Amino acid sequence: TGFQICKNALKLPVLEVLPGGGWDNLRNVDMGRVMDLT
Amino acid sequence: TELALFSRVNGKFSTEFQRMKTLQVKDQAVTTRVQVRNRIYTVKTTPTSE
What we know:
Strand order of the largest sheet of chain A: 1-2
Number of strands of chain A: 2
Number of helices of chain A: 1
Organism (chain A): Mus musculus (Mouse)
Oligomer: part of a larger assembly
Shape of chain A: elongated
Order of helices and strands of chain A: HEE
Largest sheet of chain A: 2 strands, antiparallel
Radius of gyration of chain A: 13 Å
Largest interface: A-B, 5 and 4 residues
Subcellular location (chain A): Cytoplasmic vesicle membrane
Protein name (chain A): Macrophage-expressed gene 1 protein
Strand content of chain A: 15-25%
Subunit structure (chain A): Homooligomer; predominantly forms a homooligomeric arc-shaped pore complex instead of complete rings of 16 subunits.
Structural class of chain A: alpha+beta
Family (chain A): Belongs to the MPEG1 family.
Distance between the termini of chain A: 4 Å
């Protein structure tokens, strides 16, 4: 569930805007991680 | 003033008064304000933290 293997292999940044993270539509800030990102 | 009497007695009287004045004022006022505010990350705690 970590990308450090990926970064070591490819020498590339990992995209930093990732979906799946829940979003409180009242005060509009990310709240938690729902979908598993491996 | 020039006064001549009998075409022999002469008298001259020349006066002069120069009066110069100069006043200079200069004011200057510079104000500057730089406000910078970076916000890089936002660090939140996982709901499964102990």
